[PDB]
Scaffold this active site. Structure first.
Site, PDB file in Angstrom:
ATOM      1  CE1 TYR A 472      -4.162   1.903   0.820  1.00  0.00           C
ATOM      2  CE2 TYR A 472      -2.692   3.240   2.157  1.00  0.00           C
ATOM      3  CZ  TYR A 472      -3.910   3.065   1.540  1.00  0.00           C
ATOM      4  OH  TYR A 472      -4.888   4.040   1.652  1.00  0.00           O
ATOM      5  CB  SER A 553      -7.094   2.806  -1.836  1.00  0.00           C
ATOM      6  OG  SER A 553      -8.127   3.752  -1.637  1.00  0.00           O
ATOM      7  CG  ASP A 640     -14.647   4.044  -5.046  1.00  0.00           C
ATOM      8  OD1 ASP A 640     -14.650   4.979  -4.223  1.00  0.00           O
ATOM      9  OD2 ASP A 640     -13.641   3.339  -5.265  1.00  0.00           O
ATOM     10  CG  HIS A 679     -12.842   3.101  -1.489  1.00  0.00           C
ATOM     11  ND1 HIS A 679     -12.111   2.884  -2.632  1.00  0.00           N
ATOM     12  CD2 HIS A 679     -11.963   3.519  -0.552  1.00  0.00           C
ATOM     13  CE1 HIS A 679     -10.839   3.150  -2.397  1.00  0.00           C
ATOM     14  NE2 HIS A 679     -10.724   3.538  -1.142  1.00  0.00           N
TER      15      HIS A 679
END
Ligand SMILES: O=C([C@@H]1CCCN1C(=O)CCn1c(=O)c(-c2ccccc2)nc2ccccc21)N1CCCC1
Length: 709
Positions: A472, A553, A640, A679
């Protein structure tokens, strides 16, 4: 490619000037979601992906196997509110887990709130709840189709009676009941013209803090705070343990820093009738202040002020000067203090992060002294329960090959011996057949980045196994051990290796780890991650041809760039709801909040960092001839509202046009826009199984790997 890519109109007149720099964004029309052009675009793309995915006979294998292995009892921690106990439980394959209630740990649990009967497809999820001090009243938020927006409804705990109260236009809200139990604090947004279901891209500014008196209409809610001067500020509120103080955390951005005001409810002339007599205790964004507990006027907070790794401090509202603050538990030289809870009036539960692993210890409130250290294998603490008035705690512990263990500890006992409350087992998987290993690999600059490796016991390192690398990197988010049947199936019936790289940008090693992967050093994130792959390749774990990188994301932005920068290092790439347009990401919904990690194109200096890695503006055909772009699958949903899908659309159009058109490019560049999803939070089990079975099918069919019964 047995399929041909769609014809997407390129608006060559869509040019913008960024501090002398002119950038062309020809697919900028996709920014309108309700247009016939866009709708016809999404459809067109789904027309070639679904088949591709459903054509591979490995999808149904996976899908069916996932359904079996994922069919296990999933409970949450038990928590007591009032005189009753509560806990979420999922028989196994229920779309949304259910909240159970029992008048006693030995009593007979009974359904309290089943969100499953609100939607035939489980796309209505519970998003945040807050009981009253007496545990007699309960308020919960509901979200439709993974949308961030929320509707707060209320319930009478006894007899689960549903009340008329309802609050709309709620988003990113707090739910703080006052102890007189007459009303609750919550945040709402202004009435904006247009849609508000999560399909709109409108900006979210001017959030206010209101007060809802139970039994009245929202038209009457009291406005208790607003910052008309600072549109992006977001004030969240909570009540001090003794319920005499309303603590207001004011925020701007996603940084671990906040202003902290407060209001002595006993100093309000007639209770709550409007803007409160706030006392600006901390009027700056230098550090974060996380309320733990308070004895009279001495408030204890978890702060990172001058403490990159966090620590505990005490402030006396009567002696506010920073100078007079006292340190209760000094910051640690290596361990990050994640969260803190006060239980049994004078006990403090500190949860530390030690080399990406979680440690739980009991400290004394008065002195800070360490009392007990709760034994924990390697993994994370996913749940906890214990308030200042409770005399017992609960905490769920999870790992890579551990579905979760719920421990219990009676604090009213001389010997603080914690026992096992519940242990969920997933038959079909033999933890003893796989092995976890944590290595630290060096990055481009020489920094050591930790990595978790999970693979079958005895595999020879000949670089012949498929590898799944996850990362991430950003927003202080720590990627810690967690259970994932869907990932283990990859290792099981696909013979692959799983790897999680805790690259910079996260909060694994304090904020100093966050700042080394943000703003002007964002590249560090990518280098860290790229080096991770190199490592698996060198050490013969896998190969560039059979290596897959995943990320959602801010994590999808990671993999998207890592492809634009080294497409020769990866064979497959799966970006989930990712941020691709680094130039105008801040113009939509809640994107302004992320400027604290990326910067803002509106600034000449920031532009120079962003234009260099922005995924949308950096797609380029490899110069070499024996090198092409890795097979890529983009995943997003129409609802989203977190990272508006216009990011994935304009990016798939570009990938297909610039690269997809070349003849040396064989690997598919696809995208999947799911309906009624957002999301990610609140996604029903059904959709989760559909999704994962799509990613690993893509991977299977793309790398041509066989199934291993
Ligand atoms: O999703 C994201 C970023 C990173 C972490 C969460 N996030 C979001 O921006 C999370 C949004 N968000 C919240 O949801 C809440 C909130 C608090 C209590 C209850 C409910 C909501 N408070 C916030 C305060 C400041 C900024 C954002 C906030 N991103 C996607 C792309 C990169 C950033």
């Amino acid at each position: 490619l047995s399929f041909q890519y769609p014809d997407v109109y390129r608006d060559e007149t869509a040019i913008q000037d960024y501090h002398g720099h002119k950038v062309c964004d020809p697919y900028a029309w996709l920014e309108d979601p309700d247009s016939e052009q866009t709708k016809a675009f999404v459809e067109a793309q789904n027309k070639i992906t679904v088949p591709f995915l459903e054509q591979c006979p490995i999808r149904g294998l996976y899908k069916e196997r996932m359904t079996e292995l994922y069919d296990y009892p999933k409970y949450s921690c038990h928590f007591k509110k009032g005189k009753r106990y509560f806990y979420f439980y999922n028989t196994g394959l229920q779309n949304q887990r259910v909240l159970y209630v029992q008048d006693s740990l030995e009593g007979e649990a009974r359904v309290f709130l089943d969100p499953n009967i609100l939607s035939d497809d489980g796309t209505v999820a519970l998003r945040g709840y807050a009981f009253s001090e007496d545990g007699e009243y309960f308020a919960y938020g509901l979200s439709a189709s993974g949308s961030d927006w929320v509707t707060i409804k209320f319930m009478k705990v006894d007899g689960a009676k549903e009340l008329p109260d309802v609050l709309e236009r709620v988003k990113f809200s707090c739910m703080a009941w006052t102890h007189d139990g007459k009303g609750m604090f919550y945040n709402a947004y202004p009435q904006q013209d247009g849609k508000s279901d999560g399909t709109e891209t409108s900006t979210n500014l001017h959030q206010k803090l209101y007060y809802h008196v139970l039994g009245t209409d929202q038209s009457e809610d009291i406005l208790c705070a607003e910052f008309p001067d600072e549109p992006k500020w977001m004030g969240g509120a909570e009540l001090s343990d003794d319920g005499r103080y309303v603590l207001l955390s004011i925020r701007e951005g996603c940084d671990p820093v906040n202003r902290l005001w407060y209001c002595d409810l006993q100093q309000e002339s007639n209770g709550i009738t409007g803007i409160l007599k706030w006392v600006k205790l901390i009027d700056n964004f230098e550090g974060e202040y996380d309320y733990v507990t308070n004895e009279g006027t001495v408030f204890t907070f978890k702060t990172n002020r001058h403490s990159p790794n966090y620590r505990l401090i005490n402030i006396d509202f009567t002696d506010p000067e920073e100078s007079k603050w006292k340190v209760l538990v000094p910051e640690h030289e290596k361990d990050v203090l994640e969260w803190v809870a006060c239980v049994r009036s004078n006990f403090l539960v500190l949860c530390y992060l030690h080399d990406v692993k979680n440690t739980l210890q009991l400290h004394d409130l008065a002195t800070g002294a360490l009392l007990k250290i709760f034994p924990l294998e390697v993994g994370s603490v996913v749940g906890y329960s214990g308030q200042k008035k409770d005399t017992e705690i609960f905490y769920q512990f999870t790992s890579f090959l551990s579905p979760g263990i719920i421990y219990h500890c009676d604090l009213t006992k001389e010997e603080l011996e914690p026992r096992v409350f519940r242990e969920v087992t997933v038959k079909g998987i033999d933890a003893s057949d796989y092995q976890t290993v944590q290595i630290f690999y060096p990055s481009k600059d020489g920094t050591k980045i930790p990595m978790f490796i999970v693979h079958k016991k005895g595999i020879k390192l000949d670089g012949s196994h498929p590898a799944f690398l996850y990362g991430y990197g950003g927003f202080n988010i720590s990627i810690t051990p967690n259970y994932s049947v869907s990932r283990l199936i990859f290792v099981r019936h696909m013979g692959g290796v799983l790897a999680v790289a805790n690259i910079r940008g996260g909060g694994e090693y304090g904020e100093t780890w966050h700042k080394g992967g943000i703003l002007a050093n964002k590249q560090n994130c990518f280098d860290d991650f790229q080096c991770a792959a190199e490592y698996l390749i060198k050490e013969g774990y896998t190969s560039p041809k059979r290596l897959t990188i995943n990320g959602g994301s801010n994590g999808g932005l990671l993999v998207a760039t890592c492809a634009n920068q080294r497409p020769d290092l990866f064979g497959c790439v799966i970006a989930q709801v990712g941020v691709m347009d680094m130039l105008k990401f801040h113009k939509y919904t809640i994107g302004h909040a992320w400027t604290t990690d990326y910067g803002c194109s509106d600034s000449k200096q920031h532009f120079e960092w962003l234009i260099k890695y922005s995924p949308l503006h950096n797609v380029k055909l490899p110069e070499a001839d024996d090198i092409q772009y890795p097979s890529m699958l983009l995943l997003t949903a129409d609802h989203d509202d977190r990272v508006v899908p216009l990011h994935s659309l304009k990016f798939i159009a570009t990938l297909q046009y610039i690269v997809g058109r070349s003849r040396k490019q064989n690997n598919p560049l696809l995208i999947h826009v799911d309906t009624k999803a957002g999301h990610g939070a609140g996604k029903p089990t059904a959709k989760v199984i559909e999704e994962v079975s799509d990613m690993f099918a893509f991977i299977a069919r793309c790398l041509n790997i066989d199934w291993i019964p």
